[PDB]
Structures are given as C-alpha cells and as structure tokens.
Amino acid sequence: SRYTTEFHELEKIGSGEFGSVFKCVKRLDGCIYAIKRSKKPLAGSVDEQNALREVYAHAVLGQHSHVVRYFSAWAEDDHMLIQNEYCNGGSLADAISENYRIMSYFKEAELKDLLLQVGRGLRYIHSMSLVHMDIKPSNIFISRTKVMFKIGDLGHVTRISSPQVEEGDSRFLANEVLQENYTHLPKADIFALALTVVCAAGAEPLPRNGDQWHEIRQGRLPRIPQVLSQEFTELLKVMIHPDPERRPSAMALVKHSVLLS
Ligand SMILES: COc1cc2c(Nc3cc(Cl)c(OC)c(Cl)c3)c(C#N)cnc2cc1OCCCN1CCN(C)CC1
C-alpha cells in the first residue's frame, strides 16, 4: 500500500471510534507525521460528510502556524488515511490530564498564551469565511521546542454565510447553535474557546446537559480552583455571554489588552 510504501509506522498514539492515529516517519524526507487511519465511511453517512468537511477545508485553508498543517489524504483497501503535522506535545486534553496526574497546572500567563494563540488560529479561519464548530481541548494540539498551540480536527468545519451545521461536543456548545440559530457561527467558536481555556485552568469536568449546563449558557463562568486576575476572568466571562453579538470576534480577541502579550 501507499501507507506502507511511503511511511514507516512507529507507534499508535490515538484510538477510538474515529479510527486510530499513528506516529509515522516518511521514508523520503525522514520527517515525523501523524496519520489517521480509519474505515472508509459509508456513502451518505455523517462520517463521510465529516471526512468531506475535513479534506475540503484544506482546499480553502492555507498554511497557518496555529492550525495543524495538512499534507495529504487518500483512500486504499477500504480505508481512509489523513497525513498531518506531528505535534510532539500531544493534545491539550492529554496535557490537562497529565497536569491532574502529577499535580501541575497552567499558570495564568500560560492560559492567556493559550487563549491568544488559538485566538489567532480562529481569526484566520474566520477570515476565510469558515467556522471550526468543534473547538475543545482534544482538538487543540501542542508543538514544543517554544510552545505552539494549533487547531486540529476540521471534521466540523463549515461556511459562515452558507451554514450546514453538524453540532460539536455538547459540553462546549453555545445555546444558540442548539436553538438552530446559525447567524453568528464565529461566536460559537469563541464560546467554545473560553470553556476550553476554563478546562485548562483546572475546572471540574463540564456538564453534557442538565442544570449546570444551562447555568453556563446563562453566562455563568464555571468554578476555577486557581487565582486568575478579575480582568482575565471578565474576558472569559464575556466570551460566553448569552448574546453572541456581545462576545468579541476572534480579531477583537487577539487585540485585547489583557492578552497582549
Ligand atoms: C493523541 O496522540 C496524538 C495525536 C496527534 C494528532 N491527532 C490527529 C487528529 C485527527 Cl482528527 C487527524 O485526522 C485529521 C490526524 Cl491525522 C491526527 C495530530 C494532528 N493533526 C497531531 N499530533 C498529534 C500528536 C499526538 O501525540 C503526540 C505525542 C504522543 N506520545 C507521547 C509519549 N508516549 C506516550 C507515546 C505517544
């Protein structure tokens, strides 16, 4: 196969219903890549159009330092393979879990660094008239050696002015998207990013539904166990404002005083 011929598989680094991700060395350049290998989705299914959204997003998206670089995608032997940039820091989700294990944490400065960098990624995507629609720790990836946060997993990417919306994780989902209101989709990414940072700040696991789910959608910031400045807190707070029009845009976010620099 092209997979075996072009690459040497080093180790499986991720698995799940989405398939599996392998750390691979490309024989030609000797560089490390992350390759997702999954069953070729059923024609007409959500998994197909999910994969369609991923591959067709890079047709629009160029290279950006806060978006995981895409190299190629192909199908063979009833399997689909996507070759991406390898981020040696793994996902933000794993980093959060590792913090919990060894009792470390992200300092307030590091949290603002995370917000700004992913903010820069969102600004570019939005400027291409696209929206990510699934921003969460597991979809944020880390490159080190000196720390670069990159947006990955474009399986939910869709147009701004042509809304075809497949909802993302309910834990990060803005209420207006649930209400089938797609007039301000960029602000949905902003909403999810705030909760993503709140996750990195060491907050308890976000609710999938129920009471405290609604309280968050009311604009209530989840309890954070560490001391953040009231100014950073208020920024995160407005990012989850019930009115998406009061939430800052991505380009307004990256220009914000508390974040710079
Ligand atoms: C979770 O594992 C990793 C997934 C990564 C990843 N996912 C991904 C998602 C999707 Cl949806 C894709 O399909 C479009 C494709 Cl192709 C890849 C991208 C991307 N993109 C980039 N970088 C990653 C890096 C990872 O681990 C890095 C170090 C792990 N190391 C630590 C020491 N030890 C325990 C051995 C394992």
Side-chain angles (χ1 to χ4, degrees):
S1 69
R2 170 179 170 179
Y3 181 59
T4 312
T5 302
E6 189 176 353
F7 308 93
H8 175 64
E9 175 178 301
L10 291 186
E11 56 169 320
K12 180 186 295 184
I13 58 188
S15 63
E17 146 187 80
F18 55 89
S20 62
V21 181
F22 296 95
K23 174 187 180 182
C24 298
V25 174
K26 185 175 181 185
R27 307 180 191 273
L28 196 67
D29 56 26
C31 294
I32 309 178
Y33 298 92
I35 295 181
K36 184 170 73 62
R37 187 181 190 270
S38 59
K39 63 179 182 296
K40 187 174 171 58
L42 179 63
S45 64
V46 290
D47 280 331
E48 178 177 55
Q49 139 182 6
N50 252 23
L52 288 176
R53 270 173 280 161
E54 165 82 38
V55 58
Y56 281 140
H58 299 291
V60 180
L61 290 185
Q63 191 176 48
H64 196 274
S65 67
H66 296 298
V67 179
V68 177
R69 182 174 178 188
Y70 164 90
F71 290 92
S72 66
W74 72 96
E76 59 175 350
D77 189 35
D78 210 50
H79 278 80
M80 162 175 58
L81 299 99
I82 305 178
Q83 171 197 0
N84 277 349
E85 176 186 14
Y86 178 80
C87 302
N88 53 13
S91 69
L92 179 60
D94 292 336
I96 292 175
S97 293
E98 180 66 17
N99 279 346
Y100 191 92
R101 188 194 93 175
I102 66 179
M103 281 179 43
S104 202
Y105 62 94
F106 294 115
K107 301 140 71 150
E108 179 170 347
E110 297 172 355
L111 290 171
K112 294 176 180 177
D113 182 29
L114 166 66
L115 178 57
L116 176 60
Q117 289 199 23
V118 178
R120 290 181 181 267
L122 286 181
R123 175 173 60 166
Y124 171 67
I125 296 180
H126 293 173
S127 67
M128 301 299 296
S129 297
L130 299 179
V131 287
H132 188 273
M133 297 303 297
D134 201 23
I135 292 297
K136 57 178 178 173
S138 61
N139 289 337
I140 305 300
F141 296 90
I142 309 171
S143 288
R144 296 183 180 276
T145 314
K146 261 139 23 198
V147 173
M148 291 290 175
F149 296 100
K150 302 175 182 295
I151 299 177
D153 204 335
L154 303 191
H156 290 81
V157 168
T158 189
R159 287 197 191 178
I160 299 180
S161 295
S162 157
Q164 253 79 353
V165 179
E166 176 75 43
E167 303 173 346
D169 198 316
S170 64
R171 296 172 300 182
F172 303 85
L173 190 65
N175 189 68
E176 70 271 3
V177 177
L178 197 68
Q179 296 183 329
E180 302 179 5
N181 186 349
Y182 312 142
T183 51
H184 301 297
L185 290 185
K187 300 302 184 65
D189 282 341
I190 292 299
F191 183 92
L193 174 52
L195 295 184
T196 293
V197 174
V198 167
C199 287
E204 259 267 288
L206 302 178
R208 299 196 18 197
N209 54 83
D211 180 32
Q212 31 171 347
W213 183 95
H214 286 99
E215 310 191 341
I216 293 178
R217 303 322 191 266
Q218 291 169 23
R220 245 304 185 178
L221 210 57
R223 183 169 294 104
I224 293 184
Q226 64 174 293
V227 178
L228 306 175
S229 58
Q230 254 300 343
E231 336 300 352
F232 190 32
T233 296
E234 277 285 335
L235 176 64
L236 294 175
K237 190 181 188 324
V238 72
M239 287 178 64
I240 62 169
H241 197 278
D243 191 340
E245 301 201 56
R246 246 211 86 194
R247 304 170 197 161
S249 64
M251 69 156 329
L253 175 62
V254 300
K255 295 289 289 185
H256 209 272
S257 170
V258 71
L259 290 187
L260 295 185
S261 183

